[PDB]
A and B are shown apart, each in its own frame.
Chain A
Amino acid sequence: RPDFCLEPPYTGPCHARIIRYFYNAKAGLCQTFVYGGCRAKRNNFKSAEDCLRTCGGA
């Protein structure tokens, strides 16, 4: 799987409170986190399904 899947979630500098998903390699599942709205990293998905399809098993 892509290495970006191993990066911690990144909220960014914008002040929004947008629910997004990131892959947590420690637990082996995609978890939710709050995204600020701008400058998202790659381990940031709009659905748990997209996240698992991209990072599952990393």
Chain B
Amino acid sequence: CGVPAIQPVLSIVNGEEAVPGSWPWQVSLQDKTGFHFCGGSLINENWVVTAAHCGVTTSDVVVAGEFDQGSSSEKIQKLKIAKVFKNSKYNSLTINNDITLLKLSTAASFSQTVSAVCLPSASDDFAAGTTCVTTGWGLTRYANTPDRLQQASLPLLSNTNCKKYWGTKIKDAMICAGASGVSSCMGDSGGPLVCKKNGAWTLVGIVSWGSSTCSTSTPGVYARVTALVNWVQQTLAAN
């Protein structure tokens, strides 16, 4: 996990186009018509982790190996969803514990453009200031979504610095990043916020919420995977 067959080229509003297939775990969550409403991350061949607020259902589909959503010829994998596991602790009022697992009907065929991201340990500590990356097909300007997958490097923020803006809205299962010239935006939800752990890309956050105008000087808020990974492991173990 966490090692793309195709290396990404570093250096979402104000982000940049990603090298095709360089973020193999990124999936597009779409309705039966092909309409992209959220992103997601493959954690293995049969499971996808996304945000709880995305409201995924078994009627929706997981699209893996995609880069250009405007290309009808591009080879991709349209995977059906067998069951949806929304974290029962998801708070629809505070948006805390914003995570959902998707169990595929048919396993994804891993390849050069389709593979899994690594999951962290509940005790992992990704220092504030650490430069991580987020990806997705969300708006690049706050309008329709970009056809090609975007990426952006951004720093993790300490809870103290995040609260300087969001105050008590920041809960324990949330981690902030950004306010650095880039921002996740409409359509990025459920997607990954990854940081390197021993060189391997590991899921530290899940795009959740933030500025209502996708301001690049405001902290972005993500579901803190370290606070939710035990729930993830348990769910996989029981299913």
Interface residues of A (CB under 8 A from B): 11-19, 34, 36-39
Are A13 and B209 in contact, CB atoms less than 8 angstroms apart?
A: yes
User: Are B95 and A15 neighbours in the complex by a CB distance under 8 Å?
Assistant: no
* B interface size (C-beta, 8 A): 26
Q: What's the nearest-Cβ distance from chain A to residue B76, in Å?
A: 19
Q: Which 9 A-B pairs have the closest CB atoms?
A: A37-B53, A15-B189, A16-B189, A17-B187, A13-B209, A38-B53, A14-B209, A14-B53, A17-B37
Tell me which residues from 27 to 42 in chain B have a Cβ below 8 Å from any Cβ of chain A. 35-38
Query: Does B185 sit within 8 A of A, measured CB to CB?
Result: yes
**A-facing residues in B180-199 (Cβ within 8 Å):** 184-190
Measured in the bound complex, the distance between the Cα atoms of B55 and A16 in whole Å is: 9
CA distance A14 to B55 in the complex (A): 12
Judge whether A17 and B51 touch: CB under 8 Å.
Answer: no
**Chain A residues near B211 (CB-CB < 8 A):** 13
Which residues does chain B contribute within 8 Å of A34, judged by CB atoms?
Answer: 186
